[PDB]
Structures are given as structure tokens and as C-alpha cells.
Design a protein around this ligand. Structure first.
Ligand SMILES: Nc1nc2c(ncn2[C@@H]2O[C@H](COP(=O)(O)OP(=O)(O)O)[C@@H](O)[C@H]2O)c(=O)[nH]1
Ligand SMILES: [Mg+2]
Lengths: 605, 180, 58, 58
């Protein structure tokens, strides 16, 4: 009859009162899905209200409502009415029946024709980072999978009426396997069903579709469930996926850790290097793990035996040799650059004659350093812990070359600045050494950027204040003229350091205000330096004992992956780790040639 | 493989063949007597370029509370099918004034398609006489392209729900634009 | 001369040679601050071990 | 600075329908955890007609 009383009838489950609703709807041509029977803000129809007010797990008014709805002919719209509120948008009546753990009602709605692929797009159905509470994959099957409801999942995937395919993706592209990685915590109770349901769904999608691998459907961000686990810091599911073993012969091609031979305790296991070492063909789980993973569990995942032994093998094969070759090449290039700048005659305006053999050597060295700079630009624009400092160095050297070609002498200074950055950059090579490691890891880049900001502020302050002071100077020692500003800046810097002389005060007309301004300037410069040192010590002690004890593994992994990425793709494939092995027959019957890495271990239980 | 779902929203003036077009596309049968104000909560299976797409047909109306809840249908849309009757021109001159702004305000960077529904009436004698009584003529196809030029829409195709002509290629174009 | 300057005050005679003294000042100050930070790191290593590694190792 | 009575006055809701003018936190809609409430802004964003609780507070 009316919404306020009807919502009370369904809540109380009084079937004896809902008797007259059907004749009322027939005589007034009204359907249960009209706004006269819907809460305006939440669009919640009668059925969603009926699905929370449950006594003993049953609500007898729901079959009556469905019977009335079918007579009205609005059964499809009544069974699939979505919420409209920003906090619950898209939530149909199926999601409520799955969250409430009511398998009987889930069966009822799925039989009546509920939308089995209804995406819940509400704010609460968004990831925690994006401002949400429960991100379950937005799908009715994904909600059941993330709610630990294996029977409801099986029912949804094997309905006589309509089955939900496991290959479906939500707005963000997260499939059912992706939603099990975003709901997986590191606790032991949570990982004993996330992995179990992960394997259940993987095998179910393998038998239903033999030609499709559900672990191969990338989301919108290009991440498979393994890469998502690596990025989001989920150690347990990551270990389960990298160490997955399945016994069923029909679906035994989904395994990744194939036992090869055993001798009592010891046994050899071939791990599958799929997305762990792609040789640059696609995203590699190792690269996301070292760089993209910002979680504190990065070292635990790097300690997983396949990854750790793969990194060790990469270091053994070409890591040390190529690292030392890179160190020698940089050192020699920097020495060449230092020599060519030094021997440069700078006779009058640029350019300068290269007729002399020494001049020809200078020209050759300039060509070499220009080639190095343009190579760094090529790498950076191909991309577009020291990348930024190698880029700035190259921009500076190209600016210097442009000034030298223009005939501007100022090039030396710009060129000199570049050289300084080149010596600072060499510390990347020293990142491994324990003594200067902590300095090379984060100080030389992050601290240099904050330091550049700090001396930018300092230089602007000093220049403006020098102008303010020279406004007070006696026009006509430090008398006002054309070159007053530069010499005055020199004197001001000398007094700031301590090697200044109070010959400045003799020129000025008004000693008292000049003294006041200078003492205030010393106060502010001391404050600037003190705040700089405070930030320095704060983000130095930001590194702690746990940090400094764990960083080394990560830094060595960074060193080896950079060296391995520096190689061309054919050279990348030439130094591949592992060998092809016939792991077994695939679904189509053909043998699977997988690059596998052999790891030897023991089990005493 | 997996059938992607695209959200389709059909906006237009009162009685411009929106719900009739949706029903003809979905149920394949032109409604005889009881055409609902809005055809809601239906997903239609379509194949484009050998790819399965489930079109979540969302309908909007201009009567009573529907004017109030039409804004809430716009979020998460993938393609907008603005509708105007070929027989009734007032919708055509109103499309740029009201429909183009409302869609743009709630649906930025979303493909826009304007469709000429009730195309069969272009040659109808009764409708022509009724328009001449008000000093009007049916929307020409050149006029439709001229209207699409102002908006910059994805395309302009005419539909006749009663005759079931053009009711398929329009949705094919809509899902092709949504796939972009 | 630079070793003498970094160990003690040296009157900054070299800025007489330079065409551009401002860039020389910037380089000198950034070198001094970088040296101070490197010293602070290579000495906070021992201090960190002293306040961090005596928990069960001492 | 009495947080308790200030909090109570700010979100005063009277369930009685005879005198509901006193209430300040009306409830437009509330499904599950989310509560959409109209908070009366009298004497808060005064706009200069009256003293503002924001001005006194800050
Ligand atoms: N001649 C003709 N009439 C149509 C066509 N489509 C709809 N109509 C009629 O136009 C009337 C209004 O259409 P309707 O879909 O209810 O308008 P809406 O609710 O604004 O979309 C209906 O009663 C139909 O009989 C068409 O293609 N040709
Ligand atoms: Mg309609």
C-alpha cells in the first residue's frame, strides 16, 4: 500500500499482511520498483530490505514478493535493482545475499534470473587506498570468493540457469584471482583459504576452459595476479603462486615447481621462470618487486628461494664482470672529461682552433663526452637510484656544448658544474661497499635534490639581500658603481663564512641600520644552515638498524637488474638463467617447453 | 572469451522513441500497448568485430521524479545515445541547447551519439500535415549531420523502432565507440 | 690549496683567478656541505652500531 | 572548552515530533554504517550577522 508500512511488513516478515499488495498493484498499475516503493537516496527496493531482516536464516516474505513481482512482470528489474547512493552504487540484491551467507536465497535469486555479473561500483567497494573499505572485485562471484564461500562459488559457477565465468573483469580489470590478492593479508588464517580458493578457481577455470589460463588475464594496469601480489606486498599468496604444485593429471600443467630427482632428504625442484625472468619481453615480477613494491615485506619476498638463487646466478654469470667493466668505463670517461676540460686553451671567445695535435685530442675527448651525454638522453627518452642525476649531468653538458658552439665563454662554468655532477654520480658504483653504501643509497640523490632546493632558497635570499644592502652603499672600497654587486656578493659570502672583513661598514653612510641588517642576515643564514643540518640528521637517522641491516640485499638486486637491463634484448636472452625442460604434457597434448631454474633443497619431515 | 560490459545511456526529449528503441533492440518486439516509461536493468548481448559485449542499457525519462534521478544514471557511462524524433524537429533544435550540455557536465570524455528515432515518420503523410500545420518540416539527414557537426558527436544514424530498421547498426556503432 | 682550504681558512685567493666567482662560491659551498654530510654518515655508522647493536651483541 | 556539552549541542537530535525544532542533526537517510545528516549551521557559519563558533574556537 505504502512504502513506510511495506518496509515494515518485509522487516517483520508478515506474509499475512502482504496479501492485499498484489491487488493494489494490479488495480493501480503499480510495480514494486516504482519510486513510491523505493527509498529515494539508496534506491533500495523491497527485496534488499527483505534480505537483512532475517529470522533463523529464513524470511517467508521474499517468496511472496517474488510471486507478486512475476505477476507484475517486473521480476527482472525487481531482482536486479541497484543502489544509487555514491557509497553503495551498483549493489544489487545478489551481493546482499552473498555477504549474508544465505546460499538458499542466492539460489533463489539466481534461479529467478538475477544478474550474476552485476558490478558494485560504490565507494565502499573501492580499494582502501582509493578511500574504500571492502574491495572484493565488484562481482558476485568475486565477492563469494573473497568471502570464503566455496559452496556458493561452486553454485555460481555451475548453475543450471546461468553460470558466472571466472574470466570476467571488473571496472579496474581485476578478475576473481586479482580480487583474492587484494583481500589477502599476511596472517596465517587468511592465507590458508586465499591460496585454497585461488587454486580451486584456477583448476575450475582450467577444466571448464582447457585453452585458457586464468592466471594470464592481465588487469588494466598490466599486472597478472603474481605481479599484483609482488606489488601489493602479499607474501603468502606470492609464495603459493611461485611454489604451486597440483597433482591432478588433467590439470597438472598449472604447476610451477616440478620435482626432478630426489635422494632421501635432498631433492631437486625446477621452478618455472614465467614472469620471474622475461628477458625484457614483458613486465617481470622481479622488477616490480625491487622497484614498485614499497612495502616493508620486500626483503621477505626477495628471500624466496627461486628469486634469491636467480639473483645469485645473475651475479655469478655476468654481474661482477659487467659491474667492474662499467666502473672502469665510467672512471676512464670521467678522467677523459677532466683532462679535456683542463687542457682546453680557452684563448679569447669560443670556438677555438683544433689545429694542434693536443687540440685534436681535446676535440676527440669532447666528442667522446658528447656521445656519452647523447647516449644518456637516448636511454632517458626511451624511458620517458641515480637516473635523474645521470640525466641532469647530460642536460648540463649539452647546455655547455650549445654555449660553446654559440661562442659564449660562460660554457666553462656550466661545463664545470656538469663535471662535478659526474664525480657525484660515480658513487652509484660505490653503493655496494659497506663504508659508503649508506651515503650512496639515498643521500646522493634525494639529499642532493633537497640540497638543490636549499641552496636555491639560499642563493635567492643572498642575492636579494645583497641588492638591499647595496641600495644603502655610498654612491661615487665598496663604493656604488657598475661592478658593485659582484664584489659585494663576494664580501657578503666571506663574512658569512668567517673570512670577511668589516671594510664594508666604512663605506656606508648610515652605519647603524647597516649593522642591524647584517646582524639579522647572520641570524637568518644561521637559521637556514641549522634547518638544513636538522633535515640532514633527521633523514639520516631515518635509516635505522633494521634498515641498514636489510638494505644491502635490495641494493645488490638493484645493481644486478640495472646491469641486466642495460643489455640489448638479444644480449638479455643470451645470458638467460635456467634451461628448457620438458615439464609435461599441456591441455592440448603438446609438451610444455618452460625455462626452469633448478633449486636443490632438503625435507626432513 | 570473457564478454566485456559497456554502460549505455539513452537520453532525449519526451516521446522521442527512446524506450521503444531499447525494447526493439533487446526483446526484438516493438511494444504494442504498454510501453514502459523507462526500460531499466537490462543487459543485451551484441557481437562486434568477433568480440562479445554486454550492453547495460540505461534509460532516462523527463517526467516527474525521473528528471531528478536522471543525473544519477550518468556516472560510469561508456557511450551516450542522445535521441531526437526525425518527425519532431523541436527535439533537434533543443538537443544542442539542453542535451549536449547536460551530458557533457556529467559525462566528460565520453563518446556522444545522436540518433534520429521514428525515421518512418519522415515520409508519413499525417506527420507531414501536422508539421505543416505548425509550419515545420521533418528532420533532413543533412540537418542531422549539421546538428552532429555542432556537437562534434561520434556519429548520426536514423532509427525506426516500429519498422525495426536501423535499430541494430546504431547499437553496433555505440558499442564500437564504447570499446574505444 | 684546496686541502688547506677544506682543513682551514685560506683567504679564497683562487676566486682571483676565476672569471665567474658566483659559480665558484656555489661549488665551494656544495662541496663543503657534501663533505660534512659524508663525514656525518661515516661517523653515525659507529654511533648507530653503538646505540643499535649493544642490545644482545655487547 | 567543554568538549562534552559542545559535542552534544552540536549533534542534538530530538526524536519527539512535537518539538523537533530544537534538534540540529536531522537525518536525511541512513543505510547501514553511512548516515547522511543535515547539521544545522546556525551560529556556526554566521556570515557576520551573529558571532561564529568558528571564530571563537580558532
Ligand atoms: N511511427 C513510429 N512511432 C514510434 C516509433 N518509436 C516509437 N513510436 C511511438 O512513439 C510513442 C512514444 O515512444 P516512447 O518510447 O514511449 O517515448 P519515450 O518514453 O520518451 O522513449 C510510442 O507510443 C510509440 O508508439 C517509430 O520508430 N515510429
Ligand atoms: Mg521512455
Amino acid at each position: 500500500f505504502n512504502r513506510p508500512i511495506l518496509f515494515d511488513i518485509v522487516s517483520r516478515g508478515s506474509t499475512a499482511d502482504l496479501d492485499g499488495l498484489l491487488p493494489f498493484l494490479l488495480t493501480h498499475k503499480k510495480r514494486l520498483t516504482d519510486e513510491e516503493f523505493r527509498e529515494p537516496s539508496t534506491g533500495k527496493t523491497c527485496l534488499p530490505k527483505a534480505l537483512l531482516n532475517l529470522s533463523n536464516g529464513r524470511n517467508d516474505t521474499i517468496p511472496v514478493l517474488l510471486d507478486i513481482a512475476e505477476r507484475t512482470g517486473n521480476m527482472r528489474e525487481f531482482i536486479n535493482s541497484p543502489f544509487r547512493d555514491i557509497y553503495y552504487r551498483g549493489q544489487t540484491a545478489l551481493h546482499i545475499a552473498i555477504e549474508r551467507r544465505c546460499k538458499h536465497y542466492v539460489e533463489l535469486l539466481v534461479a529467478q534470473g538475477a544478474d550474476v555479473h552485476a558490478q558494485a561500483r560504490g565507494r565502499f567497494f573501492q580499494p582502501k587506498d582509493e578511500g574504500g573499505y571492502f574491495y572484493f572485485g565488484e562481482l558476485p562471484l568475486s565477492l563469494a570468493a573473497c568471502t570464503n564461500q566455496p559452496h556458493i562459488v561452486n553454485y555460481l559457477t555451475e548453475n543450471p540457469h546461468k553460470k558466472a565465468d571466472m574470466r570476467r573483469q571488473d571496472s579496474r580489470g581485476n578478475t576473481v584471482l586479482h580480487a583474492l590478492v587484494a583481500i589477502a593479508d599476511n596472517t596465517r588464517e587468511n592465507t590458508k583459504f586465499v591460496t585454497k580458493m585461488y587454486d580451486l578457481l584456477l583448476l575450475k577455470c582450467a577444466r571448464l576452459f582447457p585453452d585458457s589460463n586464468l592466471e594470464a588475464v592481465l588487469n588494466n594496469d598490466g599486472l597478472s595476479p603474481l605481479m599484483m601480489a609482488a606489488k601489493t606486498g602479499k607474501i603468502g599468496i606470492f609464495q603459493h603462486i611461485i611454489r604451486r604444485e597440483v597433482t591432478d593429471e588433467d590439470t597438472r600443467h598449472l604447476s610451477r615447481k616440478f620435482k626432478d630427482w630426489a635422494y632421501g632428504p635432498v631433492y631437486s625442484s625446477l621452478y618455472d621462470l614465467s614472469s620471474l625472468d622475461t628477458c625484457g619481453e614483458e613486465a617481470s615480477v622481479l622488477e616490480i618487486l625491487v622497484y614498485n613494491s614499497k612495502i616493508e615485506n620486500r626483503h621477505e619476498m626477495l628471500a624466496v628461494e627461486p628469486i634469491n638463487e636467480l639473483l645469485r646466478d645473475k651475479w655469478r654469470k655476468f654481474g661482477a664482470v659487467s659491474f667492474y667493466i662499467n666502473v672502469v668505463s665510467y672512471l676512464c670517461a670521467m678522467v677523459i672529461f677532466t683532462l679535456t676540460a683542463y687542457y682546453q686553451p680557452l684563448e679569447g671567445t669560443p670556438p677555438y682552433p683544433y689545429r694542434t695535435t693536443v687540440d685534436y685530442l681535446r676535440l676527440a675527448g669532447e666528442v667522446i663526452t658528447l656521445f656519452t651525454g647523447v647516449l644518456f638522453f637516448f636511454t632517458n627518452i626511451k624511458d620517458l637510484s641515480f637516473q635523474l642525476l645521470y640525466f641532469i649531468y647530460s642536460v648540463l653538458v649539452i647546455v655547455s656544448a650549445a654555449l660553446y658552439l654559440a661562442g659564449i665563454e660562460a660554457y666553462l662554468a656550466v661545463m664545470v658544474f656538469a663535471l662535478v655532477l659526474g664525480w657525484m654520480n660515480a658513487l652509484y658504483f660505490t653503493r655496494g661497499l659497506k663504508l659508503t653504501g649508506t651515503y650512496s643509497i639515498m643521500i646522493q640523490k634525494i639529499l642532493f635534490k633537497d640540497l638543490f632546493r636549499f641552496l636555491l632558497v639560499y642563493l635567492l635570499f643572498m642575492i636579494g639581500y645583497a641588492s638591499a644592502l647595496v641600495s644603502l652603499l655610498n654612491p661615487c672600497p665598496s663604493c656604488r658603481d657598475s661592478e658593485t654587486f659582484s664584489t659585494f656578493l663576494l664580501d657578503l659570502f666571506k663574512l658569512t663564512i668567517g673570512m670577511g672583513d668589516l671594510e664594508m661598514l666604512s663605506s656606508t653612510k648610515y652605519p647603524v641600520v647597516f649593522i642591524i641588517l647584517l646582524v639579522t642576515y647572520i641570524i637568518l643564514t644561521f637559521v637556514l644552515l641549522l634547518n638544513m643540518l636538522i633535515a640532514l640528521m633527521g633523514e639520516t637517522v631515518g635509516q635505522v638498524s633494521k634498515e641498514s641491516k636489510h638494505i644491502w640485499k635490495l641494493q645488490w638486486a638493484t645493481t644486478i637488474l640495472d646491469i641486466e637491463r642495460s643489455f640489448p634484448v638479444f644480449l638479455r636472452k643470451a645470458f638467460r638463467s635456467g634451461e628448457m625442460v620438458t615439464v609435461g604434457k599441456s591441455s592440448d597434448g603438446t609438451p610444455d617447453r618452460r625455462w626452469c631454474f633448478r633449486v636443490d633443497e632438503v625435507n626432513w619431515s | 572469451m570473457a564478454a566485456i560490459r559497456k554502460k549505455l545511456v539513452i537520453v532525449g526529449d519526451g516521446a522521442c522513441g527512446k524506450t521503444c528503441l531499447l525494447i526493439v533492440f533487446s526483446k526484438d518486439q516493438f511494444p504494442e500497448v504498454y510501453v514502459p516509461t523507462v526500460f531499466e536493468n537490462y543487459v543485451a548481448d551484441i557481437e562486434v568485430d568477433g568480440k562479445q559485449v554486454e550492453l547495460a542499457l540505461w534509460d532516462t525519462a523527463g517526467q516527474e521524479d525521473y528528471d531528478r534521478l536522471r543525473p544519477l544514471s550518468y556516472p560510469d557511462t561508456d557511450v551516450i545515445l542522445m535521441c531526437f524524433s526525425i518527425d519532431s524537429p523541436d527535439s533537434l533544435e533543443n538537443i544542442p541547447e539542453k542535451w549536449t550540455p547536460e551530458v557533457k557536465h556529467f559525462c566528460p570524455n565520453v563518446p556522444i551519439i545522436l540518433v534520429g528515432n521514428k525515421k518512418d515518420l519522415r515520409n508519413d503523410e499525417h506527420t507531414r500535415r501536422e508539421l505543416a500545420k505548425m509550419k515545420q518540416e521533418p528532420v533532413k539527414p543533412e540537418e542531422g549531420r549539421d546538428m552532429a557537426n555542432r556537437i562534434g558527436a561520434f556519429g548520426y544514424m536514423e532509427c525506426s523502432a516500429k519498422t525495426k530498421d536501423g535499430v541494430r547498426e546504431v547499437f553496433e556503432m555505440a558499442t564500437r565507440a564504447a570499446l574505444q
